[PDB]
Amino acid sequence: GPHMISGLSVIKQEVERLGNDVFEWEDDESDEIA
């Protein structure tokens, strides 16, 4: 997977749909997943 290189500084990441509170749909807690 993606990893760091050299030096020290902030990090940048991507996203396809998620990203917002690592959740953006019905509801992670939703019983739909239990």
Binding site: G1, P2, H3, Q13, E14, V15, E16, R17, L18, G19, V22, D28, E29, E32, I33, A34
Partner: protein
């Protein structure tokens, strides 16, 4: 096609960081990730993200999987963790406590085949 989705979107450090907060959000929860084996012939899930409680069992989780793919009663679906088939009374709580990873989040896998490999 790829394999991971909800876990592929971001790197691991992202997950570990997530569980780092989910611990302050829902301590009485069991973060897991439902996945579909490649060998399997069943339809792959839409995404791998399942936040089962610390009460739901293994035989209770599958149901959730049989919900997504809405698999018919004429099909079969078996869970697999590390290539091992856990019991039904294997409270997902005691499962995520023995199947936990550095990330913290669980990583389960279901397949229409109860085979190994």
């Amino acid at each position: 096609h790829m394999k991971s989705t909800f876990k592929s979107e971001y790197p691991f450090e992202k997950r570990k960081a997530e569980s780092e907060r989910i611990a302050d959000r829902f301590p009485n929860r069991i973060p897991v990730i439902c996945e579909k084996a490649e060998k399997s012939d069943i339809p792959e899930i839409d995404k791998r993200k399942y936040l089962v409680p610390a009460d739901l069992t293994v035989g209770q989780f599958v149901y959730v999987i049989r919900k997504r793919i809405m698999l018919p009663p004429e099909k079969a679906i078996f869970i697999f963790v590390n290539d091992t088939l856990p019991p039904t009374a294997a409270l997902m709580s005691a499962i995520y406590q023995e199947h936990k990873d550095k990330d913290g989040f669980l990583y389960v896998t279901y397949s229409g085949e109860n085979t190994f490999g």
